[PDB]
Design a protein around this motif. Structure first.
Motif, PDB file in Angstrom:
ATOM      1  N   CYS A 544       8.483  72.317  17.848  1.00  0.00           N
ATOM      2  CA  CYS A 544       9.824  72.436  18.405  1.00  0.00           C
ATOM      3  C   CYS A 544      10.676  71.287  17.891  1.00  0.00           C
ATOM      4  CB  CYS A 544       9.809  72.432  19.939  1.00  0.00           C
ATOM      5  SG  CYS A 544       8.577  71.335  20.679  1.00  0.00           S
ATOM      6  N   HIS A 545      11.991  71.473  17.982  1.00  0.00           N
ATOM      7  CA  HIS A 545      12.962  70.419  17.727  1.00  0.00           C
ATOM      8  C   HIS A 545      14.065  70.521  18.772  1.00  0.00           C
ATOM      9  CE1 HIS A 545      10.902  71.609  14.099  1.00  0.00           C
ATOM     10  NE2 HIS A 545      11.786  72.555  13.832  1.00  0.00           N
ATOM     11  N   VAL A 546      14.777  69.411  18.982  1.00  0.00           N
ATOM     12  CA  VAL A 546      15.892  69.365  19.920  1.00  0.00           C
ATOM     13  C   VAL A 546      17.084  68.691  19.253  1.00  0.00           C
ATOM     14  CG1 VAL A 546      14.197  69.089  21.773  1.00  0.00           C
ATOM     15  CG2 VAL A 546      15.544  67.123  21.016  1.00  0.00           C
ATOM     16  N   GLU A 551      18.722  65.985  23.964  1.00  0.00           N
ATOM     17  CA  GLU A 551      17.917  64.745  23.851  1.00  0.00           C
ATOM     18  C   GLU A 551      18.394  63.792  24.954  1.00  0.00           C
ATOM     19  OE1 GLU A 551      15.049  63.663  22.180  1.00  0.00           O
ATOM     20  OE2 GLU A 551      15.441  62.102  23.679  1.00  0.00           O
ATOM     21  N   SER A 554      17.332  65.274  28.480  1.00  0.00           N
ATOM     22  CA  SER A 554      15.922  65.014  28.743  1.00  0.00           C
ATOM     23  C   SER A 554      15.668  63.543  29.041  1.00  0.00           C
ATOM     24  CB  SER A 554      15.074  65.469  27.557  1.00  0.00           C
ATOM     25  OG  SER A 554      13.752  64.972  27.658  1.00  0.00           O
ATOM     26  N   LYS A 555      16.411  62.645  28.390  1.00  0.00           N
ATOM     27  CA  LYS A 555      16.325  61.228  28.725  1.00  0.00           C
ATOM     28  C   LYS A 555      16.697  61.000  30.183  1.00  0.00           C
ATOM     29  CE  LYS A 555      16.143  57.894  26.896  1.00  0.00           C
ATOM     30  NZ  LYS A 555      15.760  56.723  26.066  1.00  0.00           N
ATOM     31  N   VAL A 559      10.938  63.834  32.231  1.00  0.00           N
ATOM     32  CA  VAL A 559       9.827  64.757  32.432  1.00  0.00           C
ATOM     33  C   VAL A 559       8.534  64.090  31.981  1.00  0.00           C
ATOM     34  CG1 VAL A 559       8.883  67.028  31.898  1.00  0.00           C
ATOM     35  CG2 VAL A 559      11.351  66.730  32.108  1.00  0.00           C
ATOM     36  N   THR A 561       5.819  65.497  30.808  1.00  0.00           N
ATOM     37  CA  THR A 561       5.445  66.151  29.529  1.00  0.00           C
ATOM     38  C   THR A 561       3.979  66.549  29.561  1.00  0.00           C
ATOM     39  OG1 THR A 561       7.026  64.620  28.603  1.00  0.00           O
ATOM     40  CG2 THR A 561       6.010  66.088  27.058  1.00  0.00           C
TER      41      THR A 561
END
Lengths: 634, 48
Positions: A544-546, A551, A554-555, A559, A561
């Motif tokens: 995957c990529h974001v 980004e 999510s920071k 999470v 993970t």
């Protein structure tokens, strides 16, 4: 008896242990036809014995004399002028002047190897074809014979299955054009019984041959199915040698009369797992799919997510036939799944309208989505776990399907047994089964507690409430509540586990979908976060990529993970459903009723025995101290 | 005290310490370990 095998080695070795040329690829082809003719039949065996007698040898000798006469200087140019053959085509032939190169060490290799193969094959031809075609050291020999017989029996049991696995990790490792028409026929092999085993195997030998010719590790597969046919022929030959029936019996030899397995250790040991037959197939497939759910973690696995649910909440006799549809609903998914997987092996020039349907969100999201629905994308490198998992579940389903076709079935716990109270192996098995309903079944639930989820709290409250009531429930045999309690357990520890594992894939696909649905100023997604702090969260997959905005979100979200159900959910589900179809009958009911009477018993009886015996101990220690003081004093 | 050879104010130390932690990324664990080691090294010296 076995220098034909030593010969085998040599021909293949000489042909294959240097640069390829016409001579070399012609011999390889002749070897392949020899193996194919052996595969055809045993009268063909006799005919190939007639063969060596007349071939390969004369072709090896004339090639030797041709290369020897070509090695002379001067005659090369004379032959070139006469036959008008180009030097490049002569090199492709393989006939090259070695003296002009100065590599004298090259000449002796193919001056010793073909002569050696020639002499050994004449020695084999004039010797072996007579007798072979006509047909506490003593204790050590007997033990060696016993082990040889046992391993031969295990081979004829499970070499047919091995030829599937040793051929599929190969295609899984490397995928190309010359494999597409192979694997489909592979899917047509296990999906059909042994009645065409002679034919479909030939279909293998015809194609993996041609792909080798397309070349100019596979030879491991060649010797593999050659050995499979070898044991197929040899078992029949051995049976005919001792005047034994030629029928292919699934049961090697009823040693412990199957159900008399209890016999003992090595006595059960075998059919304990040999007659695994039923236990094997059913429970292990419900486990093969479960372990496959981790290996996939994609939307393609969501389809089979509910097919196991179709089994787990109904009686086996209730959904007996629909599972026969299920085993064929996956027998055809593997082939076109692979067909899409390959797509265009080298390359092509054409587009994809699925991407066209998709627009205005993010480029990363469509890549992730295409990965999740598991269909083709140009240039994407895929792992090999999915193929192996689907292959193993297909084999287990087909085995269990043969079980069902062998025989099926036409208000209470029907099946029942008898008592003898324990037996080493069972002593062990009975003792662990007595406590299995307490710690073995619930340690997996404890792992579920460790599963760090809100659904883990769902497990937590239930198990905490169950620990207090169920214990007194089982040990008393509530009248007109046994089936009711077991249905409660079904909805309790069987319904909840699947009911919480079914979203474990679609919630992560939700997290992986169109990039963002959560991150702005005022008041919506701080409460859409309190739920996303534990509901959608990891959406974890190792590809995957974001982008920058997701980004930063999510920071902020922080999470952990790690939420994959492999650690604590699937291994709990699997234990529960390994139990479900077993403890609902058999000794369980016997031991369950064994739990009630004992109450009244040791409750009002050994209590007085205990007070009395403690006073009795008091008396002995009292007297002993009196005695020692006397004696110390005396 | 002079500009040529001066001490470090607590403002700069706090800013650098805050900067050290935020350089990671959520997924990669190597970034976690790197930030851990770097902050542990930096915090071993007082502002004096």
């Amino acid at each position: 008896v076995y220098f034909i095998f030593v010969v085998s080695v040599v021909l293949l070795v000489v042909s294959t242990c240097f640069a390829p040329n016409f001579y070399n690829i012609l011999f390889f082809a002749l070897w392949a036809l020899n193996l194919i003719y052996l595969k055809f039949s045993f009268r063909l065996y006799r005919g190939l014995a007639y063969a060596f007698w007349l071939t390969l040898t004369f072709y090896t000798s004339i090639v030797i004399i041709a290369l020897y006469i070509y090695q002379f200087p001067g005659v090369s140019q004379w032959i070139i002028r006469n036959t008008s053959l180009s030097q490049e085509w002569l090199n492709a032939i393989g006939l090259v002047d070695f003296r002009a190169i100065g590599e004298s060490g090259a000449l002796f290799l193919q001056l010793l190897a073909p002569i050696a193969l020639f002499v050994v094959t004449m020695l084999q031809l004039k010797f072996f074809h007579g007798p072979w075609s006509r047909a506490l050291v003593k204790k050590l020999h007997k033990l060696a014979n016993q082990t040889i017989e046992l391993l031969w029996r295990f081979f004829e049991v499970h070499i047919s299955k091995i030829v599937f696995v040793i051929i599929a990790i190969f295609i899984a490792n490397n995928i190309n054009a010359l494999y597409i028409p192979l694997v489909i026929l592979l899917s047509l092999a296990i999906c059909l019984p042994s009645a065409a085993d002679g034919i479909f195997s030939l279909f293998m030998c015809a194609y993996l041959f041609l792909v080798a010719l397309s070349k100019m590790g596979v030879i491991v597969s060649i010797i593999a199915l050659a050995f499979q046919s070898i044991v197929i022929y040899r078992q029949r030959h051995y049976r005919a040698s001792l005047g034994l029936p030629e029928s292919m019996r699934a049961k090697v030899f009823p040693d412990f009369h199957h159900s008399h397995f209890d016999r003992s250790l090595k006595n059960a040991i075998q059919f304990l797992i040999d007659y695994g037959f039923y236990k094997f197939g059913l429970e292990i497939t419900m486990i093969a799919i479960g372990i496959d759910i981790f290996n996939r973690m994609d939307a393609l696995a969501a389809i089979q997510c509910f097919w196991l649910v179709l089994f787990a909440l109904n009686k086996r006799v209730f959904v007996r036939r629909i599972w026969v549809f299920y085993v064929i609903y996956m027998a055809i998914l593997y082939p076109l799944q692979f067909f899409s997987y390959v797509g265009l092996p080298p390359d092509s020039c054409i587009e994809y309208p699925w991407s066209y349907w998709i627009p205005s969100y993010s480029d990363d999201a469509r890549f992730n989505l295409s990965y999740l629905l598991n269909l083709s994308i140009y240039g994407v490198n895929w792992p090999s776990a999915y193929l192996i998992g689907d292959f193993f579940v297909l084999l287990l389903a087909s085995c269990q399907l043969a079980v069902f076709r062998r025989e099926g079935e036409d208000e209470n716990p029907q099946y029942d047994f008898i008592d003898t109270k324990k037996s080493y192996v069972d002593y062990f098995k009975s003792f662990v089964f007595h406590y299995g309903h307490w710690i073995t079944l619930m340690s997996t639930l404890a792992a579920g507690i460790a599963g760090t989820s809100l659904f883990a709290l769902g497990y937590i409250i239930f198990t905490l409430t169950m620990l207090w009531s169920g214990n007194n429930l089982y040990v008393m045999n509530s009248t007109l509540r046994s089936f009711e309690h077991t249905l409660k357990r079904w909805n309790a520890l069987l319904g909840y586990t699947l009911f919480t594992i079914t979203m474990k894939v679609c919630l992560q696909i939700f997290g992986c979908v169109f990039l963002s649905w959560f991150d702005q100023s005022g008041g919506w997604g701080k409460t859409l976060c309190i739920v996303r702090q534990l509901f959608s969260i990891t959406c974890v997959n190792n590809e995957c990529h974001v982008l920058k905005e997701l980004e930063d979100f999510s920071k902020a979200c922080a999470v952990e993970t790690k939420e994959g159900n492999i650690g604590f959910d699937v291994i709990a589900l699997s234990f529960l459903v390994f139990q479900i179809r077993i403890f609902h009958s058999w000794y369980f009911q016997h031991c369950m009723v064994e739990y009630r009477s004992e109450v009244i018993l040791a409750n009002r009886g050994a209590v007085l025995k205990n007070q009395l015996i403690e006073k009795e101990m008091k008396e002995q220690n009292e007297q002993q101290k009196a005695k020692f003081n006397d004696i110390r004093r005396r | 005290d002079n500009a040529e050879l001066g001490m470090i104010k607590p403002d700069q130390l706090a800013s650098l310490n805050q900067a050290l932690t935020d350089s990671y990324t959520t997924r990669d664990t190597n970034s976690i370990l790197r930030s851990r080691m770097s902050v542990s090294y930096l915090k071993g010296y007082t502002y004096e």
